[PDB]
Design a protein around this ligand. Structure first.
Ligand SMILES: Nc1nc2c(ncn2[C@@H]2O[C@H](COP(=O)(O)OP(=O)(O)O[C@H]3O[C@H](CO)[C@@H](O)[C@H](O)[C@@H]3O)[C@@H](O)[C@H]2O)c(=O)[nH]1
Ligand SMILES: Nc1nc2c(ncn2[C@@H]2O[C@H](COP(=O)(O)OP(=O)(O)O[C@H]3O[C@H](CO)[C@@H](O)[C@H](O)[C@@H]3O)[C@@H](O)[C@H]2O)c(=O)[nH]1
Ligand SMILES: [Mg+2]
Ligand SMILES: [Mg+2]
Lengths: 360, 360
C-alpha cells in the first residue's frame, strides 16, 4: 500500500547529465526514470509513494508537475546519509508504520525492467521470487551476487565481489515487511543491511533488465527497453512514430514525441528516442541515440550511440559517435567530430576530439 | 550611492569549484570573492548594492548571512540574458533612477585589485581614470585592449583581438552616469554596449590586478594579493598567522584562519590560505595552495599551487601539485599523486595521475 523509491544520490556515474537534474529525473526514453516505476506502481495496487531525496531537494517542483496522476507528495530529508540510503526507510519508520501495516515496496530509481509487480501474494518468500528471479544473469563486476538454490534461499550477499562468479544479481526491486524497518535502524549510513543469513522464508525478473545508471548502460537499456514497449505506447508500422515532419524513414523501432519535428530524409535508426520540442535536421542519422528535450540538430549529423542533453544546439555536419554524453545547453560548431567525449553543461565545442575524454 | 556587481554567470573557467557555488561566492583567500568588493564599496560612500544573479539564485541565503554588515539585499532576475549581463543594469534601470541620481558603480565579481574607490571626482572623465589606469599592462589574450592616449580617451574596443598588441586592458571596475542605463537598453543579450568611439570624456589601478576566474589565474592572483594585505588584516612576524596549532614554521606570508588546526612541523609555504575548521597534518607543505573549508589533510602531503575544495578529505601522503583543482567532498587515498587533474565533486581518487586531465 506504500513504496519507498530511493531517489537520493549524487549520480556520479551519469555525471554530465546529473549536474543539472537528479538521476531519477533524467529522462530515459521520453519520461523520467522514476516515472516508469511510478507508473508500474500505479498499475499495481498502491496510492502513496514516499521519496528519500538527498542530492537535490529541488525535484519537488517537477514531482508536483507529475503529481497529478499519483499521490507522491511525500518527501523526507534531514542530512546526507548515503546514496544507497539504507537509513532512508529507517529514518522514516514512523510514517510507514502508523498509516498502514501492509508490506512496502523498495526500489532503485535507476532500474528499468518489465516491472512485474504481480498481484499474486507470493507470501512464502517476499523478495526471493521478485527482484532477481531464479531460473540478473550478467556480469558480476557491478551489483551484488546472490546465491539462491531452487528452494529460494539467500545465503551469501557480497556487494562488489572481486571474482566470485554467480551471474545472478539483484534486480534492485525489493519488498519488505514492517519488521525490516524495525530490525536494524542504526541511525547512520549503511549498505542495505541485508541479514539474509538469519532467515530463509518470508522474513523480508523474467524479462529484460538493466541498471540504467551509466552512459553505455543507458544506451544498452534503451536498446533492450524500446522493443518491449511496442505493445502499449501508441501501438507506419516500422516504429512507434513514422510521420511527424515532412517525409522521413525509420529503421527498426523508435520513440518520437509528437511535439518533435523531423526533417526531409532523416533516418531515425534502431532504438532511438527524440524528446519534446526537439528539431531534427534534413538528413540526420539518429542511431541508438537519445535526444532529451529542446535540442536542435543541423543537416546531416550522425549522433550514434550517444546522449544529447537538454537545450543543446548541434551543428550542421557533426558526428557525435561512440558513448559521448552532452550536457545541458552545449553548442557544437559545424563539422565537429565528437567520439566518446563528455561535455559539461554550458560549453561550446569547436575542436575535433577523436579519443575518449572530458570537455570542461 | 549604489553599485552594480555583476554576479550572473556560469563560471565555466572555474568549473570544478563552481559546480557547487557561484563564482562570486567561491572564497578567494578566506572570504567569498565578492566580499572584498563589497567591503571596498562599504569603505567608499555607498550603502545599497544590487546584484544581477542568473546562474544560481540560491546565493540569496549566503548573501543574507553576509547581509548583517551592509544593505546588499537587492536581487533581480527574470531570464538568462548573458554572463556579461549588459542588460543587467538595463533590466533594473527603473530602480536605479527613481531612488537616486548619483553615478553608480559597475564591477565584475571575479576581479581583485587594490580597489581604489577614490573619493576624488575623476571628473576628467569617469571610467578612464579608474579601471585600466593609464600608466592592465598584461597579456592581450583576454580582456579588451583599450587604446588610451595621455589625454584620457578611448578609441578602439575589441573584446578578444587575435593579435592587436595593446597590453592595456580594462580592470573590470566601471562607473557610469544615469545616461548609460537610458542610452542603449536593447532588452536582450549584448556585450557591454561600449559606444566610446562616439564620446571622448565625462560621459561614462596602480597596484596589483588580476582577473581571478581561472585556476592558474586564481593562484597567481592570490600570490599577488596576499603581500598587499599584510598592512590591514591581523597586521611570529613572518606571516599573518604563525602559531595556531602545536609548533609549525611558515615561509613567507600566508593567511591561516584562527579556526584552523596545524600539525607539528607543517611548513605553510609562501602565499597560502587555510580555511575555517580546516585540519592540516603533522608535516604538510602548503606551497601557494588554497584550502577552502572543512578540509582534512593527512601527514606529509605536499599540496602545491593547487586548490582544495570544501569538505575534502585528503589522504596521508598525497601530492596534489601543479594546477589541480579539487571539487567539493573529494576524498583522496594515501599515496595518490595528482598533477594538474581537476576532480568533480563527490569523487574518490585512488589511482595516480601524472598528466593534466579531468576526473569524473
Ligand atoms: N548514484 C545515485 N544513486 C542512487 C540515486 N537514487 C538512488 N540511488 C541508489 O543508489 C544505490 C547505489 O547506487 P547505484 O550506482 O545506483 O547502484 P550501484 O552502486 O551500481 O549498485 C547498486 O544497485 C544495484 C542495482 O543494479 C543493486 O545491486 C544494489 O542496489 C547495488 O548496491 C542504488 O540502490 C540506487 O537506488 C541517484 O540519484 N544517484
Ligand atoms: N563566467 C562567469 N562570469 C561572470 C560571473 N559573474 C559575473 N560575471 C561576469 O561575466 C563577465 C565575463 O566573464 P569572465 O570570464 O568573468 O570575464 P572574461 O570573459 O574573462 O573577460 C571579461 O572580464 C574582463 C575582466 O578581466 C573584462 O575585460 C571584461 O569584463 C571581459 O568581457 C565579467 O564581466 C564578469 O563580471 C560568473 O559567476 N561567472
Ligand atoms: Mg544503480
Ligand atoms: Mg572574468
Amino acid at each position: 500500500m506504500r513504496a519507498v523509491i530511493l531517489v537520493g544520490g549524487f549520480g556520479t556515474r551519469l555525471r554530465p547529465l546529473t549536474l543539472t537534474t537528479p538521476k531519477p529525473l533524467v529522462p530515459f526514453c521520453n519520461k523520467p526514470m522514476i516515472i516508469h516505476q511510478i507508473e508500474a506502481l500505479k498499475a499495481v495496487g498502491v496510492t502513496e509513494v514516499i521519496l528519500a531525496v538527498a542530492y537535490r531537494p529541488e525535484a519537488m517542483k517537477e514531482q508536483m508537475d507529475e503529481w497529478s496522476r499519483k499521490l507522491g507528495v511525500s518527501f523526507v530529508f534531514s542530512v546526507e546519509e548515503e546514496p544507497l540510503g539504507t537509513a532512508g526507510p529507517l529514518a522514516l519508520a514512523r510514517d510507514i508504520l502508523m498509516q498502514d501495516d501492509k508490506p512496502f515496496f523498495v526500489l532503485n530509481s535507476d532500474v528499468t525492467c518489465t516491472f512485474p509487480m504481480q498481484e499474486l501474494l507470493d507470501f512464502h518468500k517476499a523478495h526471493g521470487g521478485e527482484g532477481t528471479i531464479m531460473v540478473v544473469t550478467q556480469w558480476e563486476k557491478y551489483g551484488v551476487v546472490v546465491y539462491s538454490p531452487q528452494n529460494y534461499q539467500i545465503e551469501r550477499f557480497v556487494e562488489k565481489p572481486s571474482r566470485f562468479l554467480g551471474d545472478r544479481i539483484n534486480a534492485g526491486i525489493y519488498i519488505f515487511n514492517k519488521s525490516i524497518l524495525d530490525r536494524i535502524p542504526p541511525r547512520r549510513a549503511s549498505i542495505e543491511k541485508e541479514i539474509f543469513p538469519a532467515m530463509a522464508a518470508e522474513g523480508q525478473l523474467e524479462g529484460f533488465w538493466m541498471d540504467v545508471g551509466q552512459p553505455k548502460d543507458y544506451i544498452l537499456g534503451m536498446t533492450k527497453f524500446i522493443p518491449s514497449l511496442v505493445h502499449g505506447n501508441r501501438e507506419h508500422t516500422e516504429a512507434v512514430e513514422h510521420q511527424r515532419g515532412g517525409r522521413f524513414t525509420v529503421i527498426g523501432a523508435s520513440l518520437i514525441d509528437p511535439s518533435a519535428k523531423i526533417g526531409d530524409g532523416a533516418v531515425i535508426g534502431p532504438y532511438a528516442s527524440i524528446g519534446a520540442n526537439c528539431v531534427i535536421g534534413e538528413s540526420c542519422r539518429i542511431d541508438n541515440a537519445a535526444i532529451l528535450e529542446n535540442s536542435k540538430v543541423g543537416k546531416g549529423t550522425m549522433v550514434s550511440r550517444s546522449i544529447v542533453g537538454w537545450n543543446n544546439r548541434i551543428g550542421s555536419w557533426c558526428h557525435i559517435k561512440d558513448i559521448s554524453v552532452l550536457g545541458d545547453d552545449v553548442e557544437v560548431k559545424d563539422g565537429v567530430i565528437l567520439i566518446g567525449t563528455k561535455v559539461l553543461p554550458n560549453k561550446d565545442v569547436g575542436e575535433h576530439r577523436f579519443e575518449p575524454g572530458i570537455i570542461m
